[PDB]
Amino acid sequence: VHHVHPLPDSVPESEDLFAPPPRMQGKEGRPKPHIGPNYESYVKEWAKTVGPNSDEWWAAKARETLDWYDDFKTVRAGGFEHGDVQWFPEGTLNAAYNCLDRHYYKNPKKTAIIYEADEPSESREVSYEELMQETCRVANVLKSYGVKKGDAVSIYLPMTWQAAAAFLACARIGAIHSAVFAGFSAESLRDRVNDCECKVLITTDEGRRGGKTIATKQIVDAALQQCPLVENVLVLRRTGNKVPMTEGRDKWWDEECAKMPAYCPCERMASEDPLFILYTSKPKGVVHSTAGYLLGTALTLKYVFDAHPDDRFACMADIGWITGHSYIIYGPLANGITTAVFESTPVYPTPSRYWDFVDKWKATQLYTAPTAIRLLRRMGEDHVKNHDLSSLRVLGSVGEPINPEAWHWYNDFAGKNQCAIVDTYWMTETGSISIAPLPGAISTKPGSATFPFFGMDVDIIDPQTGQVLEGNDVEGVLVARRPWPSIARTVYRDHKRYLETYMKPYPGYFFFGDGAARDYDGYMWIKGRVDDVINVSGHRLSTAEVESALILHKGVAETAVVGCADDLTGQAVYAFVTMKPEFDLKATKEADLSKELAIQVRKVIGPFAAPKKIYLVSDLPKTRSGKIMRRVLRKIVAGEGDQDPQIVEEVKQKVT
Numbered sequence: 001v002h003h004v005h006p007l008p009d010s011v012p013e014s015e016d017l018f019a020p021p022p023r024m025q026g027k028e029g030r031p032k033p034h035i036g037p038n039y040e041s042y043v044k045e046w047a048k049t050v051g052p053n054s055d056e057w058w059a060a061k062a063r064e065t066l067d068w069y070d071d072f073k074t075v076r077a078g079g080f081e082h083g084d085v086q087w088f089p090e091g092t093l094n095a096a097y098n099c100l101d102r103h104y105y106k107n108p109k110k111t112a113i114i115y116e117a118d119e120p121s122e123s124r125e126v127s128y129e130e131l132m133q134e135t136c137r138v139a140n141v142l143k144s145y146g147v148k149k150g151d152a153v154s155i156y157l158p159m160t161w162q163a164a165a166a167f168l169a170c171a172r173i174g175a176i177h178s179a180v181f182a183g184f185s186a187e188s189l190r191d192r193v194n195d196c197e198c199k200v201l202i203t204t205d206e207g208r209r210g211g212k213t214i215a216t217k218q219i220v221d222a223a224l225q226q227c228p229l230v231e232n233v234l235v236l237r238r239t240g241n242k243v244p245m246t247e248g249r250d251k252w253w254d255e256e257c258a259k260m261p262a263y264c265p266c267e268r269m270a271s272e273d274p275l276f277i278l279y280t281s282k283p284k285g286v287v288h289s290t291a292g293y294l295l296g297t298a299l300t301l302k303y304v305f306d307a308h309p310d311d312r313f314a315c316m317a318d319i320g321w322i323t324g325h326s327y328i329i330y331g332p333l334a335n336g337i338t339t340a341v342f343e344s345t346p347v348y349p350t351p352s353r354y355w356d357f358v359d360k361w362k363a364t365q366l367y368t369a370p371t372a373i374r375l376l377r378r379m380g381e382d383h384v385k386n387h388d389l390s391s392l393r394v395l396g397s398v399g400e401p402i403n404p405e406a407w408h409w410y411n412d413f414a415g416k417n418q419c420a421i422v423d424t425y426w427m428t429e430t431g432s433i434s435i436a437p438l439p440g441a442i443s444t445k446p447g448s449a450t451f452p453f454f455g456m457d458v459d460i461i462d463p464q465t466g467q468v469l470e471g472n473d474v475e476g477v478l479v480a481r482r483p484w485p486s487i488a489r490t491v492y493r494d495h496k497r498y499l500e501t502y503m504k505p506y507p508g509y510f511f512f513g514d515g516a517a518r519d520y521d522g523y524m525w526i527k528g529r530v531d532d533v534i535n536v537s538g539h540r541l542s543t544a545e546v547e548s549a550l551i552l553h554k555g556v557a558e559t560a561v562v563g564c565a566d567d568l569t570g571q572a573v574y575a576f577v578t579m580k581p582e583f584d585l586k587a588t589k590e591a592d593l594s595k596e597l598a599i600q601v602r603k604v605i606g607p608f609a610a611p612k613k614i615y616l617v618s619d620l621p622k623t624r625s626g627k628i629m630r631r632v633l634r635k636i637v638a639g640e641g642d643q644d645p646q647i648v649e650e651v652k653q654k655v656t
């Protein structure tokens, strides 16, 4: 009789525990896991990484994992209270040296980047030699513009391989890159370009994604009319179609680079020099420093994905997201392996694209978001069932709770029940993965992140008392007790917002902003955003709970639940429901559908959790990174409609 339940699943709990499969046991010729074979092997190593004697392990990992120009003396200092976190502060290094040069010197012809172009036939392999040469040319171009160590440089590039060169060119010279999702509006770009006070911007003439053109240079020209500090724009000729160019201000990437040497020295950076600003969707400029962030991405890539030297790591996200920062560029390249830069969408030209890609390149790990998974689940198993896919050993999911229904579709079809599924919980502000199974050690539960990564010591606080809940079978809000190497160091020029958002809600701790539970086995369950909890008559419902109930119903593709004021219950659950496209809405009475959905939620969660209203909609408002914008739904249901962008107009109409 447990207080904490797993996310609703149609599989009974007793048949729902997944030991590392043979591909993660060193069988069938696969590499032996770095950590394994059981929970105890994870604990035995994890315990070295937290607490009063963890400096020894961190100093050793720091020294074994990165090439340093100057050694460090102190392992860590500072803390949450004033936001003065420090790691390896006396050391010096360069992120570009660690992600390129050192691997170029060992095996220059090894592939750094699998460039999977929007059109499959234009894909190709980019070696470490080629990536480094292009990075050095661009660095030299930036130096020629007068960019100095510590200057900010904005990046508005789509998912072409040169995006990594632009990141690493900034890192190479100590410039602070600020990457913005290609396709963000001129207004969103202007706000982020203005906030970081950059003088140089790197972009493309046009982007291509899913057979559509992103008019990047045209968007840039609109933003720059309200960005008085930008003096130089470097324009990558991605499509070659005619775009406006401003004399003096704008230069073609290829023509600037052709004038420059193909080597450029590395600036020697202090461990705590800023490496980048990454605005989250007022715009919050999240700042990461250099050594701790790089170390955290290198270690998490290695251990969470059990990366080995010949691996071909395929993270399918966008470099505008922290996920692309940490697990397309920095993490994999720091480890010297091969990494995918995926330019297209999961369904272009067909929903078989991910799997055609895996079998073409023999990818050994695939990493994507629940939104993509549920998208492909909606599209039917014909596009996946007849692929090989046996080069994969680890399938990861990042960005939101993964409903057990989607977890199982991932495990059965993408993994053919032979891959480990790593559900990776973290945030832009954590730098690298915070809670995840180690795939060779941890028996997984559908929808659970399982146990904290090395250096992470997390706790559950009761938000109603402000006090920590000791033990297992407890739920509340997730906090961390101690800094870890890759935590964000500030919000750019707004340190007060940093302290107030993360350090002040529960003094002594870092506050993630997510509801969480630790079950009787000690497994962590991230249940959704705290802001998204719905309090019905005292019962605190999480989004992941109710949404996982609704998706147990045949035909349901995706849902989102938001609360709203109710005189009788305090708050009422309103559900927005997306059905598969072939589901006959005329042959099933809408009222009949919502009655069955209500009964379904009442069975697996309780009599109080049924939605007061259900809205059938064709899609849900989502961000570029695939987050469902529940805050948008909540505000429309609250009648505060004034406070795929076309999807908002549809919701506002169905609710009225």
Ligand SMILES: CC(=O)OP(=O)(O)OC[C@H]1O[C@@H](n2cnc3c(N)ncnc32)[C@H](O)[C@@H]1O
Residues within 6 Å of the ligand: 280, 322, 323, 397, 398, 399, 400, 401, 402, 423, 424, 425, 426, 427, 428, 429, 449, 512, 513, 514, 526, 527, 528, 529, 625
């Ligand atoms: C990496 C990233 O997503 O960065 P970011 O864009 O900053 O979002 C952070 C928010 O995403 C949610 N989130 C991300 N991964 C999750 C997971 N595996 N399980 C449950 N929730 C997850 C949480 O709510 C986070 O607080």
